[PDB]
Design an enzyme around this catalytic site. Structure first.
Site, mmCIF file in Angstrom:
data_model
loop_
_atom_site.group_PDB
_atom_site.id
_atom_site.type_symbol
_atom_site.label_atom_id
_atom_site.label_comp_id
_atom_site.label_asym_id
_atom_site.label_seq_id
_atom_site.Cartn_x
_atom_site.Cartn_y
_atom_site.Cartn_z
ATOM 1 N N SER A 1 14.045 5.594 -12.733
ATOM 2 C CA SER A 1 12.992 6.676 -13.275
ATOM 3 C C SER A 1 13.086 8.195 -12.798
ATOM 4 N N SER A 2 12.840 8.229 -11.572
ATOM 5 C CA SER A 2 12.614 9.614 -10.981
ATOM 6 C C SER A 2 14.163 10.162 -11.070
ATOM 7 N N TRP B 1 7.338 0.262 4.791
ATOM 8 C CA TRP B 1 7.813 0.849 3.774
ATOM 9 C C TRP B 1 9.400 1.259 3.857
ATOM 10 N N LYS C 1 3.355 30.609 2.386
ATOM 11 C CA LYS C 1 2.553 30.117 1.095
ATOM 12 C C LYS C 1 0.934 30.244 1.515
ATOM 13 N N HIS D 1 0.875 -1.203 0.003
ATOM 14 C CA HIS D 1 -0.048 -0.031 0.067
ATOM 15 C C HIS D 1 0.822 1.199 0.041
ATOM 16 N N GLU E 1 12.120 13.260 0.321
ATOM 17 C CA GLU E 1 11.009 12.431 -0.462
ATOM 18 C C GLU E 1 9.687 13.153 -0.199
ATOM 19 N N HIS F 1 13.071 12.304 4.226
ATOM 20 C CA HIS F 1 12.104 13.702 4.320
ATOM 21 C C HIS F 1 12.324 14.412 2.827
ATOM 22 N N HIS G 1 14.235 13.899 12.306
ATOM 23 C CA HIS G 1 13.099 14.176 13.419
ATOM 24 C C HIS G 1 12.262 12.871 13.347
ATOM 25 N N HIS G 2 12.563 11.891 12.467
ATOM 26 C CA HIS G 2 12.116 10.669 12.295
ATOM 27 C C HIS G 2 12.965 9.568 13.077
ATOM 28 N N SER H 1 -1.414 26.577 -6.602
ATOM 29 C CA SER H 1 -1.081 28.040 -7.016
ATOM 30 C C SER H 1 -1.800 28.596 -8.382
ATOM 31 N N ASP I 1 9.687 20.000 -27.049
ATOM 32 C CA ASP I 1 9.728 18.819 -26.201
ATOM 33 C C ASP I 1 10.833 18.691 -24.852
ATOM 34 N N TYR J 1 8.918 16.101 0.824
ATOM 35 C CA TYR J 1 8.760 17.359 0.098
ATOM 36 C C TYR J 1 8.811 17.244 -1.365
ATOM 37 N N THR K 1 6.208 27.565 4.570
ATOM 38 C CA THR K 1 4.696 26.902 4.327
ATOM 39 C C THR K 1 3.600 28.006 4.784
ATOM 40 N N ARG L 1 1.462 1.707 15.939
ATOM 41 C CA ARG L 1 1.516 1.312 14.247
ATOM 42 C C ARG L 1 1.652 -0.201 14.086
HETATM 43 C C1 HEA Z 1 0.523 8.699 -1.008
HETATM 44 C C2 HEA Z 1 0.358 8.401 0.102
HETATM 45 C C3 HEA Z 1 -0.979 7.568 0.764
HETATM 46 C C4 HEA Z 1 -2.273 7.624 0.489
HETATM 47 C C5 HEA Z 1 -3.115 8.416 -0.354
HETATM 48 C C6 HEA Z 1 -2.767 6.534 1.425
HETATM 49 C C7 HEA Z 1 -4.182 6.285 1.552
HETATM 50 C C8 HEA Z 1 -4.734 5.594 2.474
HETATM 51 N N1 HEA Z 1 -4.374 4.882 3.509
HETATM 52 FE FE1 HEA Z 1 -2.052 4.642 3.823
HETATM 53 N N2 HEA Z 1 -0.116 4.624 4.321
HETATM 54 C C9 HEA Z 1 1.100 5.515 3.702
HETATM 55 C C10 HEA Z 1 0.631 6.493 2.391
HETATM 56 C C11 HEA Z 1 -0.754 6.591 1.991
HETATM 57 N N3 HEA Z 1 -1.724 6.018 2.400
HETATM 58 C C12 HEA Z 1 2.179 5.312 4.179
HETATM 59 C C13 HEA Z 1 3.677 6.014 3.722
HETATM 60 C C14 HEA Z 1 2.100 4.425 5.181
HETATM 61 C C15 HEA Z 1 3.042 3.681 6.069
HETATM 62 C C16 HEA Z 1 3.339 2.113 5.716
HETATM 63 C C17 HEA Z 1 4.089 1.636 7.241
HETATM 64 O O1 HEA Z 1 3.723 1.938 8.083
HETATM 65 O O2 HEA Z 1 5.314 1.214 6.848
HETATM 66 C C18 HEA Z 1 0.620 4.072 5.278
HETATM 67 C C19 HEA Z 1 -0.137 3.143 6.080
HETATM 68 C C20 HEA Z 1 -1.606 3.197 6.276
HETATM 69 C C21 HEA Z 1 -2.134 2.841 7.580
HETATM 70 C C22 HEA Z 1 -1.572 2.560 8.836
HETATM 71 C C23 HEA Z 1 -1.497 1.000 8.952
HETATM 72 C C24 HEA Z 1 -0.134 0.543 9.444
HETATM 73 O O3 HEA Z 1 0.565 1.410 10.261
HETATM 74 O O4 HEA Z 1 0.066 -0.635 9.340
HETATM 75 C C25 HEA Z 1 -3.556 2.874 7.283
HETATM 76 C C26 HEA Z 1 -4.734 2.704 8.266
HETATM 77 O O5 HEA Z 1 -5.405 2.081 8.093
HETATM 78 C C27 HEA Z 1 -3.449 3.234 5.739
HETATM 79 C C28 HEA Z 1 -4.982 3.438 5.268
HETATM 80 C C29 HEA Z 1 -5.110 4.308 4.238
HETATM 81 C C30 HEA Z 1 -6.349 4.486 3.723
HETATM 82 C C31 HEA Z 1 -7.810 3.943 4.214
HETATM 83 C C32 HEA Z 1 -6.242 5.353 2.390
HETATM 84 C C33 HEA Z 1 -7.248 5.843 1.633
HETATM 85 O O6 HEA Z 1 -7.205 7.370 1.996
HETATM 86 C C34 HEA Z 1 -7.475 5.541 0.232
HETATM 87 C C35 HEA Z 1 -8.421 6.636 -0.178
HETATM 88 C C36 HEA Z 1 -7.688 7.484 -1.222
HETATM 89 C C37 HEA Z 1 -8.181 7.670 -2.424
HETATM 90 C C38 HEA Z 1 -9.312 7.015 -2.856
HETATM 91 C C39 HEA Z 1 -7.379 8.384 -3.242
HETATM 92 C C40 HEA Z 1 -7.830 8.655 -4.912
HETATM 93 C C41 HEA Z 1 -6.993 7.552 -5.696
HETATM 94 C C42 HEA Z 1 -6.406 7.768 -6.523
HETATM 95 C C43 HEA Z 1 -5.869 6.622 -7.466
HETATM 96 C C44 HEA Z 1 -6.277 8.977 -7.027
HETATM 97 C C45 HEA Z 1 -6.456 9.089 -8.643
HETATM 98 C C46 HEA Z 1 -6.541 10.557 -9.163
HETATM 99 C C47 HEA Z 1 -6.011 11.051 -10.295
HETATM 100 C C48 HEA Z 1 -5.020 9.765 -11.025
HETATM 101 C C49 HEA Z 1 -5.896 12.389 -10.825
HETATM 102 N N4 HEA Z 1 -2.204 3.400 5.251
HETATM 103 C C1 HEA Z 2 3.167 15.194 2.065
HETATM 104 C C2 HEA Z 2 4.583 15.076 2.772
HETATM 105 C C3 HEA Z 2 4.675 15.467 3.939
HETATM 106 C C4 HEA Z 2 4.473 16.809 4.480
HETATM 107 C C5 HEA Z 2 4.328 18.005 3.749
HETATM 108 C C6 HEA Z 2 5.005 16.990 5.786
HETATM 109 C C7 HEA Z 2 5.047 18.313 6.690
HETATM 110 C C8 HEA Z 2 5.659 18.324 8.170
HETATM 111 N N1 HEA Z 2 5.754 17.187 8.759
HETATM 112 FE FE1 HEA Z 2 5.642 15.055 8.236
HETATM 113 N N2 HEA Z 2 5.575 12.936 7.700
HETATM 114 C C9 HEA Z 2 5.419 12.405 6.407
HETATM 115 C C10 HEA Z 2 5.013 13.321 5.477
HETATM 116 C C11 HEA Z 2 4.950 14.826 5.267
HETATM 117 N N3 HEA Z 2 5.092 15.601 6.331
HETATM 118 C C12 HEA Z 2 5.439 11.250 6.471
HETATM 119 C C13 HEA Z 2 5.089 10.162 5.268
HETATM 120 C C14 HEA Z 2 5.666 10.562 7.924
HETATM 121 C C15 HEA Z 2 5.960 9.367 8.298
HETATM 122 C C16 HEA Z 2 7.165 8.491 7.756
HETATM 123 C C17 HEA Z 2 7.037 7.309 8.411
HETATM 124 O O1 HEA Z 2 7.230 7.213 9.731
HETATM 125 O O2 HEA Z 2 6.642 6.235 7.691
HETATM 126 C C18 HEA Z 2 5.853 11.986 8.474
HETATM 127 C C19 HEA Z 2 5.940 11.904 9.887
HETATM 128 C C20 HEA Z 2 6.467 13.177 10.479
HETATM 129 C C21 HEA Z 2 7.678 13.195 11.593
HETATM 130 C C22 HEA Z 2 8.080 11.809 12.168
HETATM 131 C C23 HEA Z 2 7.394 11.668 13.550
HETATM 132 C C24 HEA Z 2 7.464 10.136 13.733
HETATM 133 O O3 HEA Z 2 7.781 9.479 13.024
HETATM 134 O O4 HEA Z 2 7.739 9.896 14.854
HETATM 135 C C25 HEA Z 2 7.796 14.608 12.019
HETATM 136 C C26 HEA Z 2 8.589 15.076 13.138
HETATM 137 O O5 HEA Z 2 8.982 16.334 13.208
HETATM 138 C C27 HEA Z 2 7.102 15.454 10.895
HETATM 139 C C28 HEA Z 2 6.630 17.027 11.114
HETATM 140 C C29 HEA Z 2 6.492 17.759 10.011
HETATM 141 C C30 HEA Z 2 6.545 19.193 9.946
HETATM 142 C C31 HEA Z 2 6.931 20.068 10.893
HETATM 143 C C32 HEA Z 2 5.893 19.529 8.726
HETATM 144 C C33 HEA Z 2 5.656 20.949 8.220
HETATM 145 O O6 HEA Z 2 6.483 21.028 6.807
HETATM 146 C C34 HEA Z 2 4.116 21.428 8.060
HETATM 147 C C35 HEA Z 2 4.433 22.743 7.839
HETATM 148 C C36 HEA Z 2 2.874 23.256 7.748
HETATM 149 C C37 HEA Z 2 2.269 23.914 8.810
HETATM 150 C C38 HEA Z 2 3.165 24.359 10.000
HETATM 151 C C39 HEA Z 2 1.016 24.512 8.732
HETATM 152 C C40 HEA Z 2 0.723 25.951 7.910
HETATM 153 C C41 HEA Z 2 1.480 27.056 8.610
HETATM 154 C C42 HEA Z 2 0.872 27.886 9.178
HETATM 155 C C43 HEA Z 2 -0.728 28.093 9.281
HETATM 156 C C44 HEA Z 2 1.599 29.079 9.821
HETATM 157 C C45 HEA Z 2 1.436 28.984 11.304
HETATM 158 C C46 HEA Z 2 1.964 27.750 12.076
HETATM 159 C C47 HEA Z 2 2.825 27.878 12.792
HETATM 160 C C48 HEA Z 2 3.445 29.079 12.763
HETATM 161 C C49 HEA Z 2 3.061 26.498 13.535
HETATM 162 N N4 HEA Z 2 6.043 14.723 10.222
HETATM 163 CU CU LIG Z 3 9.879 13.871 7.565
#
Ligand code: HEA
Ligand code: HEA
Ligand SMILES: [Cu+2]
Ligand SMILES: CCCCCCCCCCCCCCCC(=O)OC[C@H](COP(=O)([O-])OCC[N+](C)(C)C)OC(=O)CCCCCCCCCCCCCCC
Ligand SMILES: CCCCCCCCCCCCCCCC(=O)OC[C@H](COP(=O)(O)OCCN)OC(=O)CCCCCCCCCCCCCCC
Ligand SMILES: CCCCCCCCCCCCCCCC(=O)OC[C@H](COP(=O)(O)OCCN)OC(=O)CCCCCCCCCCCCCCC
Ligand SMILES: CCCCCCCCCCCCCCCC(=O)OC[C@H](COP(=O)(O)OCCN)OC(=O)CCCCCCCCCCCCCCC
Ligand SMILES: CCCCCCCCCCCCCCCC(=O)OC[C@H](COP(=O)(O)OCCN)OC(=O)CCCCCCCCCCCCCCC
Ligand SMILES: CCCCCCCCCCCCCCCC(=O)OC[C@H](COP(=O)(O)OCCN)OC(=O)CCCCCCCCCCCCCCC
Ligand SMILES: CCCCCCCCCCCCCCCC(=O)OC[C@H](COP(=O)(O)OCCN)OC(=O)CCCCCCCCCCCCCCC
Ligand SMILES: [Ca+2]
Ligand SMILES: [Zn+2]
Lengths: 59, 269, 102, 120, 67, 534, 113, 51
Positions: free
Chosen positions: F157-158, F127, F319, F62, F243, F241, F290-291, F256, F92, F245, F316, F438
């Site tokens: 690819s990427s 993952w 933005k 997933h 990835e 991280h 931070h992970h 935008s 192109d 962003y 952010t 988890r």
């Molecule tokens: C791309 C990021 C992404 C998205 C979209 C989702 C979507 C969903 N995910 Fe998950 N998930 C992860 C990234 C994501 N997830 C990651 C990184 C983990 C960690 C694995 C790990 O712990 O190792 C995780 C693990 C995770 C957990 C934690 C389980 C665990 O820790 O073992 C759960 C809980 O139920 C969950 C459920 C879901 C559900 C119900 C949706 C639903 O939201 C699905 C509904 C979403 C849609 C229907 C989206 C539309 C579908 C499309 C295909 C878009 C098409 C559009 C165009 C092509 C224009 N996934």
């Molecule tokens: C879509 C990708 C995405 C984005 C954009 C972010 C955005 C951020 N994430 Fe997240 N994060 C993940 C994807 C992402 N994350 C994934 C996939 C994991 C789990 C990986 C795994 O364990 O499998 C994760 C888990 C994760 C962790 C690890 C925790 C843990 O595993 O135990 C942390 C730790 O600091 C973190 C923090 C943040 C912060 C501070 C931002 C910031 O960039 C957010 C900034 C936005 C705002 C702050 C809100 C808007 C701002 C305002 C309204 C201004 C006023 C607000 C303030 C002044 C606070 N997130």
């Molecule tokens: Cu991170």
């Protein structure tokens, strides 16, 4: 031995695809398709034994 | 030139490449290589003939791709100035990606060496490991790389200066010095005390310098194809970009071999 | 723009005087009502005369609909309708509320 | 039967951009062994004539329907991005004059006519 | 225009109802036997233990959520 | 037919192949999430007869499918390869055979990931494939090797597409377009390609190190031998991280564009948005630990990492305040991309605020490996990137397909996914703050109450996905009739208040990018003569 | 037949950026000749008096390490030092050959007992 | 190569002139994708004796 103008006059005045325009292209391209055709389908034949769990004979 | 005749050309300097089979052929070769090595690593395939066939198909398909690139650049005249600038920028981004791979490997070495374990003995290089001394053969390997760069520099500038024999000979000396370095690395790897299985030291050491070894054997290959294309008059005095990329490649393999030298052979002994 | 209100009115009076067709008078009217100010009565008058020169009647109605949307009150709208009444009855344009009564 | 087009006025299609070879003992310079679009560009730079127009858009004035801003094109249309009578005065409005329609900007209101210099 | 807000309100409520119904119909395909702990008697007998061990004093300790 | 699609060398065809693969793999990942969430609906074994290994394999599939096979090939692979040449005026991309192999190495990663599932037990490791679980002692067999090769082919690819993008927008811009006059989506793909180029090497190094550890008896992360798995955590998350962003920055560009064209006013401070995106990309390399707050770092390590993870809330925030400022004072045309953009602007900020709750290592000892983290990232993923992906589809689909979609069905689909995603991912914070860990297939019985409502919301989300499949079918079959009847929005900008309906007809499209001026479905040779810009 | 097909597409040919192009075309030649001259001067005055001093240094060590392997060929494996815990990791056997032998396994310097 | 322009020529699949209905191709393209984890589940449950 500086054949580059003579080869330009072949590669530009040609209808065939670019990997076929050299005169020696039939010597490269015909073996390669056979070697490629076995190289891509022989692991796909071993995929079902890997799913079932059958290892090959070594002893 | 008139409007009627200007309309029979491209209006923009960029290469519109003809459709080509080698992307999907190299993709299927990478598939066969992955599926062959993942099954010969675990015994579901008897011998290494599938992996050998897959690597051979991968190499020959890359060779046919490069043959088509040579054909486009030389026999069709498709590489204008903008295309040259783009190819140089793409090769620079490529060598930045490979420098970052080496930075990850240097991070692995440093994380093992900055404060080592207790299972090696709070020691670096670990106990029992007979480290490679930096004075004997790796000093000659630094010398024949700093000299290979000096050869390829005058070979390049004599290619620009109109000389033919002074550029072909410098390219030949560069290629032979690179294969001298590769055979000296093979001799070191045979007459080395530790192996790649001898702990984390052998792991990080052979990982870094073996990745450098693989980059050097590809460097010897591209120096050979540059010699072929210079002898057969493909390379010209103003338009030699694959040669320029090979020069960039030599001069980055030189500095990353120096970092490998001073880290893996001087600071880490 | 560090523009004063008077530079705005003197800019848009001569901007409405130099429009030459229906695209230009509608364009200039659009980008003079796209500011954070209700236009002065003089530039609305110049807009009415400009829509008279191009001979389009619904733009001279949409001028008053626009300043109805643009003012803060309904008494500011009625203040515009007081001393813009003479030019409106001279040109002979109707307001939209009296033309399409609900 | 053809020859090698010393200057730009002798280019007649792509069979005229071939080149003479190098002799045997000389490294080729690019007047010898360049062809195609690269040789066309090389010939133009030897004459000073930059082929491949990269000039930006005329934004000296404001096009009216009485004097538009004439855009030369080798097909029936051209995409043009207006930003004002100085260099940048509004958010860019992208337009497309064809041979039968001028393009009016709607933000500044400049008018672009197209003349087709190519052949169909 | 002219009653499409009503259409995309009825469609949302219809989608919610269809999702609830199909969720029920595939909950009918799950394991026929829930664990023994998910009845009222087991949860009272666990709150017995938690009251004896002073668990969660200012919040709550009670585990009963089933029938 | 074989040369246009197998031997392909134009970017607009490779983009729709990317899009077909992306939506196929998204159906796969959504099915996997439906199985996960259906098993998690109630305590005890429900649908998989015990067998927690199969649960873990499905979680791996997933995550990997939805990240590396839906969001990256959808956003970067489809939208970048389609739109960045059209928005810089390039004929192109530079290096088009590279651009074709960067697609065709993705079905091969897909087939090796699927047979990774089908061999001995699959790779159930998360993952983030951590050793020593991902080693040869704890995972015997070719499962993890094939998963690592899937990651290798996706990274190939990427990386090739990133090199392609960097060179084609530094080199092939049209003849009035300086770097300051770029559209925001081009800056998105540009900065994303640099993050890819700088981050994918360390991932490839780490998982090749893992593969050699598994198969070649070498010891990078083997403790009996001198290794350390914290080295794997560092080398992974230095990619991990950047990835995430990478996953969000093209979403920022799509938002935008959408917000400005449906507010009918330009973006408030565009160059500060470019600076903010570049600062997020630069600062994303400084926050990777931070992970790793729990693994046993120093206190000054964790103090710096809370500081650096905290100071990415500033760009952010710039933005998001700029998005609110560019909808303030507008003329909002509530179409489906605008609905998706407003939902982005709410739900992404909620995910970011839980992100700054997680940024404090003092507090992350209460939330690490809980479902709170799952709530944070599924907010900013399936409501940030998926909502911007849906916005990009509903924003560009009728232009680049030539066929309009049913507007009422699109808004029904939006409201269903906006309801359903909230119902899945909002109770996960409650579960995580009460201590639910988890990656568990079964939980204590006290966590049943929010797990049930989450898996009820899962069916709403997949029902809206099925509705989206029907919307695609109705667009492909009846898309020429949707222009004729009133089932679709034909013009995404209404006339201005004094603009006549006939004066609107000579200037039907008013855009600040070339994409909406082209012919519908755009020509195989767009830009014969180059576009020109003052 | 278009009317405007026969008019020139460029206008006036520029005469100073063609001369400046040709002087750079003929000046990088003269500077490349001098650069080649001084670089062969460097490559023979410095680079071969480096290989000439390191080959005579490495012939000595190719003698005294081959002779150390020569006397190490007479030391059987019960007189071999016992391997530490981290030495010769065997997680799974290598998929080639006979098991424990690696890719460059010289049996003199490497021994797994 | 010069390729065809138009409305349906940008997609690798055929929509309009077919001897089979298009919904066959359309919904069987997505049902296979929705059905890969069920094939996965079936074979990894038959390997573990649950069936
Ligand atoms: C791309 C990021 C992404 C998205 C979209 C989702 C979507 C969903 N995910 Fe998950 N998930 C992860 C990234 C994501 N997830 C990651 C990184 C983990 C960690 C694995 C790990 O712990 O190792 C995780 C693990 C995770 C957990 C934690 C389980 C665990 O820790 O073992 C759960 C809980 O139920 C969950 C459920 C879901 C559900 C119900 C949706 C639903 O939201 C699905 C509904 C979403 C849609 C229907 C989206 C539309 C579908 C499309 C295909 C878009 C098409 C559009 C165009 C092509 C224009 N996934
Ligand atoms: C879509 C990708 C995405 C984005 C954009 C972010 C955005 C951020 N994430 Fe997240 N994060 C993940 C994807 C992402 N994350 C994934 C996939 C994991 C789990 C990986 C795994 O364990 O499998 C994760 C888990 C994760 C962790 C690890 C925790 C843990 O595993 O135990 C942390 C730790 O600091 C973190 C923090 C943040 C912060 C501070 C931002 C910031 O960039 C957010 C900034 C936005 C705002 C702050 C809100 C808007 C701002 C305002 C309204 C201004 C006023 C607000 C303030 C002044 C606070 N997130
Ligand atoms: Cu991170
Ligand atoms: C239309 C289809 C016709 C109706 C289908 C539903 C039939 C039904 O009665 O469903 C029962 C479910 C109980 O579902 P359960 O608690 O998971 O138990 C299922 C059976 N086991 C697993 C023990 C074997 O009950 C439920 O599903 C309760 C969940 C309902 C979700 C919406 C509740 C709020 C509605 C407003
Ligand atoms: C792709 C991008 C990611 C790259 C990540 C790093 C790649 C590491 C390259 C491995 C080269 C190691 C090597 O060449 O080591 C040489 C070793 C053999 O040497 P030995 O120990 O027998 O010699 C010492 C005897 N006295 O070969 C191996 O056993 C492994 C071969 C397969 C490597 C792949
Ligand atoms: C695997 C083996 C790698 C050997 C690479 C040799 C490249 C030969 C083709 C060539 O050299 O292409 C020649 C062209 C330009 O030719 P030119 O303008 O100099 O011709 C002059 C005519 N007057 O250079 C290029 O496009 C760039 C080459 C970059 C290749 C990098 C490959 C890296 C692979 C890593 C995996
Ligand atoms: C359970 C049911 C839940 C609701 C489902 C049905 C809704 C149908 C609505 C409808 O269909 O409304 C259609 C109306 C337009 O109406 P109009 O003025 O054009 O009418 C003209 C004559 N008929 O758009 C609106 O709603 C206006 C508001 C739209 C805002 C959408 C934003 C998306 C959600 C973002 C999250 C909120 C963040 C802010 C919260 C603080
Ligand atoms: C899986 C997708 C789940 C379905 C969600 C999208 C479908 C929207 C259909 C809709 O929104 O139906 C709402 C409309 C509103 O009627 P109307 O005023 O448009 O009537 C004009 C004539 N059509 O009912 C209908 O027309 C038909 C009745 C539908 C009810 C069928 C099921 C009965 C319970
Ligand atoms: C990692 C794989 C190697 C990437 C090299 C990129 C060089 C940049 C460049 O300059 O690429 C230029 C060429 C591609 O040119 P093209 O045919 O797309 O351009 C048309 C203009 N003549 O590179 C290559 O032949 C790459 C060959 C890669 C072979 C697959 C290896 C997979 C591992
Ligand atoms: C049972 C499932 C739900 C049925 C909905 C009934 C709609 C009632 C009706 O018949 O609604 C009539 C309308 C008329 O359509 P209109 O908007 O053109 O007219 C507007 C009039 N004012 O059709 C619709 O809008 C809804 C059509 C969508 C139906 C969804 C189809 C099923 C989607 C899931 C299956 C496909 C994916 C599966 C493959 C993985
Ligand atoms: Ca359960
Ligand atoms: Zn303008």
């Amino acid at each position: 031995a500086n054949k580059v103008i003579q080869l330009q006059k072949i590669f530009q005045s040609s209808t065939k695809p670019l990997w076929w325009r050299h005169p020696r292209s039939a010597l490269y391209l015909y073996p390669f398709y056979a070697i490629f055709a076995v190289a891509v389908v022989t692991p796909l034949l071993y995929i079902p034994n890997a799913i079932r769990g059958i290892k090959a004979k070594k002893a | 030139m008139t409007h009627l005749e200007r309309s029979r050309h491209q209006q923009h300097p960029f290469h519109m490449v003809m459709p080509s089979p080698w992307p999907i052929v190299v993709s299927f070769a990478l598939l066969s290589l992955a599926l062959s090595t993942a099954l010969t690593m675990h015994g579901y395939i008897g011998n290494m003939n599938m992996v050998y066939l897959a690597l051979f198909v991968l190499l020959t398909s890359s060779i046919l791709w490069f043959r088509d690139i040579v054909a486009e650049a030389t026999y069709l005249g498709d590489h204008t100035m903008a295309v040259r600038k783009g190819i140089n920028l793409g090769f620079l981004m490529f060598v930045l990606s490979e420098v970052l791979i080496f930075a990850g490997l240097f991070w692995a070495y440093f994380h093992s060496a900055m404060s080592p374990d207790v299972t090696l003995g709070a020691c670096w290089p670990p106990v029992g490991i007979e480290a490679v001394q930096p004075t004997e053969l790796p000093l000659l390997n630094t010398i024949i790389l700093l000299s290979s760069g000096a050869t390829v520099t005058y070979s390049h500038h004599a290619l620009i200066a109109g000389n033919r024999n002074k550029a072909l000979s410098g390219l030949l000396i560069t290629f032979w010095l690179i294969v001298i370095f590769v055979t000296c690395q093979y001799i070191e790897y045979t007459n080395a005390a530790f192996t790649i299985s001898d702990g984390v030291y052998g792991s990080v050491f052979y990982a870094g310098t073996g990745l450098h070894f693989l980059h050097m054997v590809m460097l010897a290959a591209m120096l050979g194809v540059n010699y072929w294309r210079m002898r057969n008059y493909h390379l010209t005095a103003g338009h030699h970009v694959g040669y320029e990329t090979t020069i960039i490649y030599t001069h980055v393999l030189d500095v990353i071999w120096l970092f490998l030298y001073v880290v893996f052979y001087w600071w880490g002994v | 723009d560090e523009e004063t209100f008077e530079e705005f009115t003197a800019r848009y009076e001569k901007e409405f005087d130099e429009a030459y067709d229906l695209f230009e008078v509608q364009r200039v009217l659009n980008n003079c009502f796209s500011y954070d100010l209700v236009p002065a009565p003089a530039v609305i008058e110049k807009a009415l005369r400009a829509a008279r020169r191009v001979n389009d009647l619904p733009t001279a109605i949409r001028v008053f609909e626009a300043l109805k949307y643009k003012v803060e009150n309904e008494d500011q709208y009625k203040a515009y309708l007081d001393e813009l009444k003479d030019v409106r009855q001279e040109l002979g344009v109707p307001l939209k509320e009296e033309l399409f009564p609900s | 039967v053809v020859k090698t087009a010393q200057n730009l006025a002798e280019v007649n299609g792509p069979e005229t951009l071939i080149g003479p070879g190098a002799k045997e003992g000389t490294v080729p310079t690019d007047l010898d062994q360049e062809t195609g679009l690269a040789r066309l560009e090389l010939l133009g730079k030897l004459e000073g004539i930059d082929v491949f127009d990269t000039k930006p858009l005329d934004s000296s004035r404001k096009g009216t329907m009485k004097d538009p801003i004439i855009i030369e094109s080798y097909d029936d249309y051209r995409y043009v991005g207006c930003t004002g009578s100085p260099a940048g005065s509004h958010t860019i409005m992208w337009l497309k004059p064809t041979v039968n329609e001028v393009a009016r900007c709607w933000e500044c209101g400049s008018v672009y006519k197209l003349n087709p210099v190519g052949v169909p | 225009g002219k009653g499409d807000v009503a259409f995309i309100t009825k469609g949302v409520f219809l989608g919610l109802g269809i999702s609830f119904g199909l969720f029920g119909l595939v909950r009918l395909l799950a394991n026929p036997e829930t664990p023994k702990t998910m009845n009222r008697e087991w949860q009272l007998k666990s709150d017995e233990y938690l009251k004896s061990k002073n668990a969660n004093p200012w919040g709550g300790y009670s585990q009963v959520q089933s029938k | 037919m074989v040369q246009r699609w197998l031997y392909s060398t134009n970017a607009k065809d490779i983009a729709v192949l990317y899009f077909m693969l992306a939506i196929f793999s998204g159906m796969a990942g959504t099915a996997m999430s439906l199985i996960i969430r259906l098993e998690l609906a109630a305590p005890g074994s429900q649908y998989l007869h015990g067998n927690s290994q199969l649960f873990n394999v499905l979680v791996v599939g997933h995550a990997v499918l939805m990240i590396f096979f839906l969001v990256m090939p959808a956003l970067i692979g489809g939208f970048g390869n389609y739109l960045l040449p059209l928005m810089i005026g390039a004929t192109d991309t530079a290096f088009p055979r590279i651009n074709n192999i960067a697609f065709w190495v993705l079905p091969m990663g897909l087939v090796c990931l699927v047979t990774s599932t089908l061999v001995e037990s699959g790779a159930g490791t998360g993952w983030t494939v951590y050793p020593p679980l991902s080693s040869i002692q704890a995972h015997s067999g070719p499962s993890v090797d094939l998963a690592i090769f899937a990651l290798h082919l996706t990274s190939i690819s990427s990386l090739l597409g990133a090199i392609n993008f960097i060179v084609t927008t530094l080199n092939m811009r049209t003849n009035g377009m300086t770097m300051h006059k770029l559209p925001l989506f081009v800056w998105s793909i540009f900065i994303t390609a640099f993050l890819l180029l700088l981050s994918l090497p360390v991932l490839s190094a780490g998982i090749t190190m893992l593969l050699l550890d598994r198969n070649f008896n070498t010891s990078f992360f083997e403790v009996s031998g001198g290794g350390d798995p914290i080295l794997y955590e560092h080398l992974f998350w230095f990619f991990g991280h950047p990835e995430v962003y990478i996953l969000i920055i093209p979403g920022f560009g799509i938002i935008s564009h959408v917000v400005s064209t449906y507010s009918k006013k330009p973006v408030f401070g565009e160059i500060s948005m470019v600076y903010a995106m570049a600062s997020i990309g630069l600062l994303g390399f400084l926050v990777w630990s931070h992970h790793m707050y729990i693994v046993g770092l120093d206190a000054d390590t964790r103090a710096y990492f809370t500081s650096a993870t905290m100071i990415i809330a500033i760009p952010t925030g710039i933005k998001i305040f700029s998005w609110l400022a560019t909808i303030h004072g507008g003329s909002i045309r509530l179409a489906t991309p605008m609905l998706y953009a407003i939902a982005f602007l709410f739900l992404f900020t909620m995910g970011g605020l839980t992100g700054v709750a997680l940024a404090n290592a003092s507090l992350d000892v209460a939330f690490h490996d809980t479902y709170y983290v799952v709530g944070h990232f599924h907010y900013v993923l399936s409501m940030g990137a998926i909502f911007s992906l849906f916005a990009g589809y509903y924003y560009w689909s009728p232009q680049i397909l030539g066929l309009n979609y049913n507007e009422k069905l699109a808004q029904i689909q939006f409201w269903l996914i906006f309801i359903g995603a909230n119902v899945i991912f909002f109770p996960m914070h409650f579960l995580g703050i009460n201590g639910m860990p988890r990656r568990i297939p079964d939980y204590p019985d006290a966590f049943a109450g929010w797990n049930y409502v989450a898996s009820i919301g899962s069916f709403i989300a997949t029902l809206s996905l099925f509705l989206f499949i029907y919307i695609l079918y109705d667009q492909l079959v009846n898309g020429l009739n949707n222009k004729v009847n009133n089932k679709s929005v034909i013009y995404n900008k209404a006339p201005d208040f004094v603009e006549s309906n006939t004066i609107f007809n000579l200037n039907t499209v008013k855009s600040s990018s070339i994409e909406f001026l082209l012919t519908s479905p755009p020509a195989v040779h767009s830009f014969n003569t180059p576009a020109v810009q003052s | 037949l278009p009317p405007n097909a026969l008019k020139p597409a460029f206008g006036p040919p520029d005469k100073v950026a063609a001369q400046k192009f040709k002087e750079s075309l003929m000046a990088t030649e003269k500077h490349a000749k001098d650069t080649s001259n001084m670089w062969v001067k460097i490559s023979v005055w410095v680079a071969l008096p480096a290989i000439a001093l390191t080959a005579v240094n490495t012939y000595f060590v190719e003698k005294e390490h081959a002779e150390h392997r020569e006397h190490l060929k007479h030391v059987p494996d019960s007189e071999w030092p016992r391997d530490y815990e981290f030495m010769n990791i065997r997680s799974k056997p290598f998929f080639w050959g006979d098991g424990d032998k690696t890719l460059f396994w010289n049996p003199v310097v490497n021994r797994h007992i | 190569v010069h390729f065809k322009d138009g409305v349906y020529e940008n997609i690798p699949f055929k929509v309009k002139g077919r001897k089979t209905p298009y919904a066959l191709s359309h919904f069987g393209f997505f049902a296979i994708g929705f059905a890969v984890p069920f094939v996965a589940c079936y074979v990894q449950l038959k390997k573990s004796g649950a069936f």
